[PDB]
């Protein structure tokens, strides 16, 4: 089949689709904690839903990759982990709240 990826710091992952189901299910199970009026939820929900549909509709990685159209499977896994951490952090932050403090008037005025 394969011997390596083509990058440095990666691995010949022999258990795909399973780590993927795991990570996506966990993303959604965290999103459960998010108010429905938060766009982050309202978007990444469907994103991960479609990624799950794709992994379930394509079992062979050599096509799942070019189908996702993202990077290689390992890059996809890494990015999913990163989105997971981003979620855990946006949960402590309250971004979906309104604005903090508007600026003065003549700030974004270019020219000057």
């Amino acid at each position: 089949l394969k011997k390596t990826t083509g990058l440095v710091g990666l691995a010949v992952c022999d258990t795909p689709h399973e780590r993927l189901t795991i990570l996506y299910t966990k993303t959604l199970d965290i999103l459960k904690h998010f108010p429905k009026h938060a766009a982050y939820r309202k978007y990444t929900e469907q994103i991960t839903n479609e990624k799950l549909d794709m992994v379930k509709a394509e079992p062979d990685v050599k096509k799942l990759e070019a189908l996702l159209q993202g990077g290689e499977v390992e890059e996809v896994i890494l990015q999913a982990e990163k989105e997971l951490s981003l979620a855990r952090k946006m949960l402590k932050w309250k971004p979906w709240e309104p604005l903090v403090e508007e600026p003065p008037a003549n700030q974004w005025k270019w020219p000057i």
Binding site: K42, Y43, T44, Q46, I47, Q69, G70, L99, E102, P103
Partner: protein
């Protein structure tokens, strides 16, 4: 080139390649100096009519930006632009 046949053969056996065909020095394999006085072209802007600047202003077609979500002034998941089309190897020497 003024050198000898035997030395040519020796240096060539040493290197492996040929040298009398791809020397580095320059024995009249150049373009003569004292070249002739040339005559030059002009652009598509040296006409006499239908050249009104207002057509091709250039640095006045510019217009300030188009702000969004200022402080005073369902949907899909989108991106800043489509993704990168993966590349393929070459037809000549993909390995090394």
């Amino acid at each position: 080139a003024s050198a000898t046949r035997v030395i040519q053969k020796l240096r060539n056996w040493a290197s492996g390649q040929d040298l009398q065909a791809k020397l580095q020095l320059r024995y009249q394999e150049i373009a003569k100096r004292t070249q002739p006085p040339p005559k030059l072209p002009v652009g598509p802007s040296h006409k006499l009519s239908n050249n009104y600047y207002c057509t091709r202003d250039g640095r006045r077609e510019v217009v300030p930006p188009s702000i969004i979500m200022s402080s005073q002034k369902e949907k899909k998941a989108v991106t800043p632009a489509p993704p990168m089309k993966r590349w393929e190897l070459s037809k000549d020497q993909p390995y090394l």
